[PDB]
């Protein structure tokens, strides 16, 4: 395909995010950058840290421009402080352009960098509304679109156990099978969407759909788990436990506190249920559903002849987060230009000879507009 040089441009370690190479400054300084659709700041380590192999050296970049402004970004877990500036940025396995973008030079951090992750910075791909210090700090993708011809769209194929593709400016048809189904971006801050129904092994969880989106539902490549609001999490676990009752597991397993291990290659995938989220469609009263397997929501832990897994559906107090657990099933199109997100079955998703992830529709769902939090 025409976007062939962008295929396979992502790497990572399971549970530690996916990163892309970005070349910053002049002469070039290439760094590994975590791809995060759940935040909106481009930031790179810029001082030594025990967990960093390399970092951004501003004094060596002739094109660096100091903004004389500090910046601080806290995440669900982790935080960093740094200094704002602009510099030239290219993505060597991305679009054939170079932009002048805002960059936060990370000078201090807490629980942000990860020993052995191989990444040195983060690329916040969400919208300006959630940028720090405020919405006047243009995010990277905004700069890319404003300064160049590159279409206002990117797509992510995250291939779990790590690798994948970030196609920038379009879609590559080798990365999915079947059809792309689109759900509206409800509001441009996070990539916010609306979940209208949840099933476990085809069985409706039967909660009011407002619960699923309280107080938001977002697509977040920078979060590992599928995170669910407390009431939804509790109901989901009870249903998943019931569906997998041919085996018993300790309470702490379902809470992500205990791991369970199997002899290499013997994991009984079949005893665990599939999980479906129905998403609002592009036509009135029409929805579609995405369905993931235990291969997605049971995550291999690093890492003998024993395959250990963590249950990667967890509780949230800030709404639903569709993290890697969801995304690893699918090719996900962030169609900013048309304010929609597309899902199709991923050509690289992990499955078995019995079940596959799925994206199916259309279905009929009424009053979907009421599901959203105000």
């Amino acid at each position: 395909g025409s976007f062939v040089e962008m295929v396979d441009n992502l790497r990572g370690k399971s549970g530690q995010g996916y990163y892309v190479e970005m070349t910053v400054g002049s002469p070039p300084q290439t760094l590994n950058i975590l791809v995060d659709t759940g935040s909106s700041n481009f930031a790179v380590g810029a001082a030594p840290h025990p967990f960093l192999h390399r970092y951004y050296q501003r004094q060596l970049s002739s094109t660096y421009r100091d903004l004389r402004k500090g910046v601080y970004v806290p995440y669900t877990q982790g935080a960093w402080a740094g200094e704002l500036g602009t510099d030239l940025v290219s993505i060597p396995h991305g679009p054939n352009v170079t932009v002048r973008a805002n960059i936060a030079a990370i000078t201090e951090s807490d629980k942000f960098f990860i020993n052995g992750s191989n990444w040195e910075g983060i690329l916040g791909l969400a919208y300006a509304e959630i940028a720090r210090p405020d919405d006047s700090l243009e995010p990277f993708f905004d700069s890319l679109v404003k300064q160049t011809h590159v279409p206002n769209l990117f797509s992510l194929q995250l291939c779990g156990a790590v690798g994948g593709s970030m196609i920038i400016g379009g879609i590559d048809h080798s990365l999915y099978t079947g059809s792309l189904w689109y759900t509206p971006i409800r509001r441009e801050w996070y990539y916010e969407v609306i979940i209208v129904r949840v099933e476990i092994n085809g069985q409706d969880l039967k909660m009011d759909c407002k619960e699923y989106n309280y107080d938001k539902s977002i697509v977040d490549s920078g979060t590992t788990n599928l995170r669910l609001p407390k009431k939804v999490f509790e109901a989901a676990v009870k249903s998943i436990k019931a569906a997998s009752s041919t085996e018993k597991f300790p309470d702490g397993f379902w809470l992500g506190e205990q791991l369970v291990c199997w002899q290499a290659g013997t994991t009984p995938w079949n005893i665990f249920p599939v999980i479906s989220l129905y998403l609002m469609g592009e036509v009135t009263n029409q929805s579609f559903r995405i369905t993931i397997l235990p291969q997605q929501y049971l995550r291999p832990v690093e890492d003998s002849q024993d395959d250990c897994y963590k249950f990667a559906i967890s509780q949230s107090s800030t709404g639903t987060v569709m993290g890697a657990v969801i995304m690893e099933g699918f090719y996900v199109v962030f169609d900013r230009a048309r304010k929609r997100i597309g899902f199709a079955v991923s050509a690289c998703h992990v499955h078995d000879e019995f079940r596959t992830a799925a994206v199916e529709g259309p279905f009929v769902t009424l009053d979907m507009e009421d599901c959203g939090y105000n």
């Binding site: 659709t37 995440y75 669900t76 959630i130 920078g222």
Partner: peptide, 7 residues
């Protein structure tokens, strides 16, 4: 990983 708190 668990990426924005706040926004």
């Amino acid at each position: 990983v668990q990426f924005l708190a706040x926004x």
